[PDB]
């Protein structure tokens, strides 16, 4: 449990805007706040350009220290709209997104090339869900976890690539397990 985990990043516990780096800067991944019962914002990132072709929208975290862990765990809570629930002809609509990482000793990288990112997985809605009670509503979200390693630079960046889905990333947590 949390007792044996050390959190490296938790998007839910960041104060103020996440300000993660989106490419394109506008019109792709955008920050959307969902207000919880205490009027604290849940900072989500969303993109839904299902009506436009050739989507390649990237979103990357800031630098995340690995603190001497070689194996980290990435937990994402998200929701997608199924293509069959979106009216309109959408020949290129997708229901997945891609997850990547890039290791670096440099905590202030800018414009990391697409080809520097290493793919972790294609993420889809699968069997596993969680419920997040926010007062007026209970968010029923897919929950997926992936391990990454072995890591060997001082830290890393995580990235999410959309290629034409209708996706909301509601929570991203990265942790390691401490012996």
């Amino acid at each position: 449990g949390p007792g044996n985990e050390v959190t490296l990043l938790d998007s839910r516990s960041v104060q103020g805007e996440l300000g993660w780096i989106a490419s394109p800067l506008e019109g792709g991944w955008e920050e959307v706040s969902i207000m919880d019962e205490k009027n604290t914002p849940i900072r989500t990132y969303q993109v839904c350009n299902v009506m436009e072709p050739s989507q390649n929208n990237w979103l990357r975290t800031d630098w995340i220290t690995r603190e001497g862990a070689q194996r980290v765990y990435i937990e994402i809570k998200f929701t997608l709209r199924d293509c069959n629930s979106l009216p309109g002809v959408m020949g290129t609509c997708k229901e997945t997104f891609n997850l990547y990482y890039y290791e670096s000793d440099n905590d202030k990288e800018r414009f990391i090339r697409e080809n520097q990112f290493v793919k972790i997985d294609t993420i889809a809605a699968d069997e596993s869900f969680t419920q997040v009670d926010i007062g007026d509503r209970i968010m029923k979200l897919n929950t997926e976890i992936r391990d990454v390693g072995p890591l060997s630079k001082k830290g890393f960046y995580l990235a999410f690539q959309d290629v034409g889905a209708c996706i909301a990333l509601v929570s991203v947590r990265v942790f390691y397990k401490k012996a």
Partner: peptide
């Protein structure tokens, strides 16, 4: 787009 935005529920 965004064609839809997720708020509690999706709205499109």
């Amino acid at each position: 787009x965004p064609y839809c935005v997720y708020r509690x529920s999706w709205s499109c």
